[PDB]
Design a protein around this ligand. Sequence first.
Ligand code: RET
Ligand code: RET
Ligand code: D12
Ligand code: D12
Ligand code: D10
Ligand code: D10
Lengths: 246, 246
Amino acid sequence: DSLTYGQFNLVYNAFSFAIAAMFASALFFFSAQALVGQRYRLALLVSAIVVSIAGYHYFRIFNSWDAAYVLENGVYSLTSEKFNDAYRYVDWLLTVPLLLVETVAVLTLPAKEARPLLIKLTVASVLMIATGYPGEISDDITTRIIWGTVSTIPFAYILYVLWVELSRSLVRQPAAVQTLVRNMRWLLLLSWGVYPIAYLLPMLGVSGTSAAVGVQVGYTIADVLAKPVFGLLVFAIALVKTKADQ
Amino acid sequence: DSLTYGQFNLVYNAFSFAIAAMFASALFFFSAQALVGQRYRLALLVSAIVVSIAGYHYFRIFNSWDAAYVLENGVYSLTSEKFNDAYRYVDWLLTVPLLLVETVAVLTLPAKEARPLLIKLTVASVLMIATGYPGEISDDITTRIIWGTVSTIPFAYILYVLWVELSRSLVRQPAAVQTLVRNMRWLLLLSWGVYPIAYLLPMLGVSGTSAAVGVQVGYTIADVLAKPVFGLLVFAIALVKTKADQ
Ligand SMILES: *C/C=C(C)/C=C/C=C(C)/C=C/C1=C(C)CCCC1(C)C
Ligand SMILES: *C/C=C(C)/C=C/C=C(C)/C=C/C1=C(C)CCCC1(C)C
Ligand SMILES: CCCCCCCCCCCC
Ligand SMILES: CCCCCCCCCCCC
Ligand SMILES: CCCCCCCCCC
Ligand SMILES: CCCCCCCCCC
């Protein structure tokens, strides 16, 4: 249905803020390669690639939102072009595996262990995103609950596996490294937890237009926390690891 | 006069974006003290203080803008509470001298030279900001040109002195340090140059409401470039200097 002034702007502003955050962080992460040792530059480069891809999609998402509504009679009425919910899920399919690479890369695990860990996590993320999409686009609450519950299964698998692997990497490492890795553990858990909570809004009653606004804003803030903010923690780990290698 | 939908939002969004950028960078700069040597932590702390103060004032600026207009008849009409142009100039009076401290602090000059350099630059910045304010608030174009031209005199003095001092600090320093200091020279010149250009908009013809929107947006983007973005360059210099001290 139609959207109020404040509702259209909240999403409009959220997408504009995301474009700026992704592209500005892309420049930072790319240049920050020169501040860390050679062994950790791949994690910085992948982080720059992640936010560049997300920045491209938020540019497309911004245009899809702008073209979906029209200001008339003091409100925003729905136009003929429907909002493209697929841009975000296509973005997730590409960037979430890259986020997993960035995470494993800064920990410097041996290839015999890093490779099967990455495949299992990447396969799980594809299952998570693929099962979430039909529930995301449904107009039916029961359907949204069923697909979303299925999507929680690989979601819990990824977070459990990453918590254990990050905890196992702590051993022997210097104290400054250990504190950053422990805090990366929590930022991963809390930022990724925003997504299913935001997915739950259309079923907590409330107006359907208010729920749809909350979902779009929630996913956007979550993307900012899980990609550029998370990337800053990866950058700090690379700095301290570079120093420990003297 | 009254403001269109898009005009009120552009400023509304600009102030919201500034609050987020200042407070998020404040947390980063405060914590980044732990990534640099003890001799450079003061520059990081002052940078955190700068953006915390600016964040407070943009919170007050955001509320003053929100309270100055009211949505009615599909437009925004001017309310009884007038917008407070003084918040920004009071903010500049406090943070610009602190920005000058941050700049001198990361260069590690001796006290016999750092102290008189800081006093002369601080006195010039007060003169620059104080003479600019009467021209900023005038409804008369001739008055805006006269006070603004006077304000350009200490403005040019500050930029000339900082260019020379930064250039003189280059000597002997390692190659990685020298490139960052040269780029800090340019970011300072270009970011500070946005302010008088934005000040010029109300005299290039154009609608008065469009000019007022452009001034507020221009100053806000300039503040983001000259405080948190500039602070990231200071942080990089402190990182490379920490390493050169081995
Ligand atoms: C950069 C983008 C990222 C890190 C995407 C994260 C997405 C999730 C963690 C997915 C959450 C979902 C469920 C667990 C609940 C059902 C619906 C989903 C797909 C949103
Ligand atoms: C963080 C805030 C900063 C760095 C403020 C910078 C302000 C200026 C460089 C002042 C510019 C002005 C003139 C040179 C032209 C006349 C009006 C002014 C005050 C805006
Ligand atoms: C850092 C590189 C990102 C470049 C983003 C370009 C986005 C172009 C969108 C074109 C849509 C037609
Ligand atoms: C980082 C500390 C900044 C705290 C900003 C608080 C702003 C409070 C504004 C109160 C206005 C009444
Ligand atoms: C669905 C939430 C999964 C949380 C994983 C955390 C595992 C910690 C166990 C030590
Ligand atoms: C008003 C612009 C002042 C520019 C100062 C740059 C000085 C460079 C001379 C070497």
